[PDB]
Design a protein around this ligand. Structure first.
Ligand SMILES: COc1c(C)cnc(CSc2nc3ccc4ncccc4c3[nH]2)c1C
Ligand SMILES: [Mg+2]
Ligand SMILES: [Zn+2]
Length: 313
């Protein structure tokens, strides 16, 4: 009960900032997550014995893929922590409990392949879940881990609070399907501009939570330039392995996944920042003004990718 996690001074300070990198020491990541839960939620939100056993089971069910790994889970959870901390009063006790857990779990048992590759391969998951294939799997795996003996971190919630939190996590994880982001943001953009956006409207909260999940999932583009650049190597390492597997099925991959078209990475990063990243953090900043540092970091990284093209790096 009286057992806090404490971090070294530099981590204690930097963890509060949006651009924090969780570092290369894997054994510290569980403590960093527990720390974020305690400060975001309370030392009482979860039984520490059960949380610690949940965290270690979730870690075990992430695979050794270049990008969609345990480090990504904790990175995405930290970005959600930074959003929740800078927006204290806008979120309920259940939402703060649910969203950190959702982020940690959002990519459980990822194999390093897109929903498209699963469909073209005719993977069994593509028969079980026709849309948002991996995201439905990620939620399935989250529920399975919650049902292991001694892993139910939500046991002290009423039957209805339990159903509400599982429904927050499910929508949260489905929302990380980027195919769903474009529509969700257009709708949020229209509602904000015509003044109809209402945070007591549950269907509106869902949309806002969806956008927070996309913002946290993409937070690679909001770090300091060297973190951003080095994470892009991991992202492409997965994409180019998928492109290799497309070629093996006799299908030309899209250029993003073709290692033969490495040279076009800088131009492709420009399209992505302009088409996805900047619009994402712009709509989020309009809805939650204290998330502006993410939009500012994202614009800085757009400018760095423009310098790569112009041969200055
Ligand atoms: C996970 O989301 C991302 C993040 C965070 C960062 N960077 C990316 C990659 S964006 C991207 N879009 C394109 C389009 C064409 C390309 N042609 C050749 C080489 C790279 C390309 C590319 N990269 C994603 C998808
Ligand atoms: Mg995912
Ligand atoms: Zn993710």
């Amino acid at each position: 009960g009286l057992m806090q996690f404490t971090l070294p001074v530099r981590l204690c300070k930097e963890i509060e900032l949006f651009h924090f990198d969780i570092g290369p020491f894997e054994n510290m990541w569980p403590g960093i997550f527990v720390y974020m839960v305690h400060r975001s939620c309370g030392t009482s939100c979860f039984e520490l014995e059960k949380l610690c056993r949940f965290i270690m089971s979730v870690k075990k069910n992430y695979r050794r893929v270049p990008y969609h790994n345990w480090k990504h889970a904790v990175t995405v959870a930290h970005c959600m922590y930074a959003i929740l901390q800078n927006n204290h009063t806008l979120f309920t006790d259940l939402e703060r409990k649910g969203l950190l857990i959702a982020c940690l779990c959002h990519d459980l048992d990822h194999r390093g392949f897109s929903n498209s590759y699963l469909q073209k391969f005719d993977h069994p998951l593509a028969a079980l879940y026709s849309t948002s294939t991996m995201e439905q799997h990620h939620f399935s795996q989250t529920v399975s881990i919650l049902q292991l003996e001694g892993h139910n971190i939500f046991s002290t919630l009423s039957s209805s609070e339990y159903e509400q939190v599982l429904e927050i996590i499910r929508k949260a994880i489905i929302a990380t399907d980027l195919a769903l982001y474009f529509g969700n943001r257009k709708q949020l953009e229209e509602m904000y501009q015509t003044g109809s956006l209402n945070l007591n409207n549950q269907s509106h909260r869902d949309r806002v939570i969806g956008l927070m999940m996309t913002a946290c999932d993409l937070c690679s583009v909001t770090k300091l330039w060297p973190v951003t650049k080095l994470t892009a190597n991991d992202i492409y390492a997965e994409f180019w392995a998928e492109g290799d597997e497309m070629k093996k099925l006799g299908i030309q991959p899209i250029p993003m996944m073709d290692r033969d078209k490495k040279d076009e990475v800088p131009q492709g990063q420009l399209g992505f920042y302009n088409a996805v990243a900047i619009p994402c953090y712009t709509t989020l900043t309009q809805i939650l003004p204290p998330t502006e540092p993410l939009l500012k970091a994202c614009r800085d990284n757009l400018s760095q990718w423009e310098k790569v093209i112009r041969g200055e790096e």
